């Protein structure tokens, strides 16, 4: 069927999309997007691929992804919009290079260095 497995990841996650076709319905983390979130702007940043792939009338999206911070896996809703849909078809394949929202940025907080203050935040010298 359309009973698939996609995964968005920010801060070492393992996600669950219970995806099916429909008409533009969004939900996240056993909640709605108007239910867990609100008092932010990061909800409809994901609108930017969503309205340009014209899937606002075709799919039902429920990407549970947990962990991180307040607006940290608000950076994971960035990723998991088209992963479990390009495993269906190949229409929007080359039409998503303009956005560029899949690469898990490895410029996060890596290994801990002594002598410095943080990863590569340098201390006071003379």
């Amino acid at each position: 069927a359309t009973q698939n497995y996609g995964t968005g990841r920010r801060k070492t996650a393992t996600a669950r999309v219970f995806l099916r076709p429909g008409t533009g319905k969004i939900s996240i983390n056993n909640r709605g997007l108007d239910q867990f979130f609100g008092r932010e702007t990061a909800r409809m940043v994901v609108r930017q691929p969503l309205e340009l792939t014209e899937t606002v009338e075709k799919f039902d999206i429920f990407v549970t992804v947990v962990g991180g911070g307040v607006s940290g896996q608000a950076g994971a809703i960035r990723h998991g919009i088209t992963r479990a849909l390009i495993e269906y078809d190949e229409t929007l394949r080359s039409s998503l290079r303009k956005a560029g929202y899949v690469t898990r940025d490895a410029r996060e907080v890596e290994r801990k260095k002594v002598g410095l203050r943080k990863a590569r935040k340098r201390p006071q010298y003379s």
Binding site: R39, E40, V45, Q48, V70
Partner: protein, 154 residues
């Protein structure tokens, strides 16, 4: 000496529909909270026109008229007096001084509504009678004694 960086502007605003305004959460983010920033990123733009009669993208765009300079203030040596460099420059220089210093006069007002003491200066550029407009006309007539120094001894 090679320029290795690649200019990557990322502009996609969730509700506001701007063109050049979207990613500006950098000095509105005062190393703190985003939920504190929610009435002052766009909620203050929903607070500029509430005493006015327009759309808040009307007045924001026209900051590239009279608080943007004409010549540049970088210092250069030949063998004598250190000459600055007046020239007609591309918009990335003069309009860089038309957005970030317009908000930089926000502490000597100190009024009610933290959301209003950031964006209570933007509507003053309809005639251009605010705070950043005084220093832009200082630039042009402190460039009379320099304007011939572009090829000869520059």
């Amino acid at each position: 000496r090679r320029r290795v960086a690649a200019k990557r502007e990322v502009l996609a605003d969730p509700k506001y529909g701007s063109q050049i305004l979207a990613k500006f959460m950098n000095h509105v983010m005062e190393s703190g909270k985003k939920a504190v920033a929610e009435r002052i990123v766009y909620g203050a733009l929903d607070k500029v026109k509430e005493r006015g009669k327009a759309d808040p993208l009307e007045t924001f765009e026209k900051a590239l008229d009279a608080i943007a300079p004409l010549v540049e203030v970088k210092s250069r040596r030949v063998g004598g007096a250190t000459y600055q460099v007046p020239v007609e420059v591309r918009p990335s220089r003069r309009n860089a001084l038309a957005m970030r210093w317009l908000v930089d006069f926000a502490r000597k007002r100190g009024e009610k509504s933290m959301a209003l003491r950031l964006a209570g200066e933007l509507l003053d550029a309809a005639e251009g009678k605010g705070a950043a407009v005084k220093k832009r006309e200082d630039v042009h007539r402190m460039a009379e004694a320099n304007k011939a120094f572009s090829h000869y001894r520059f």
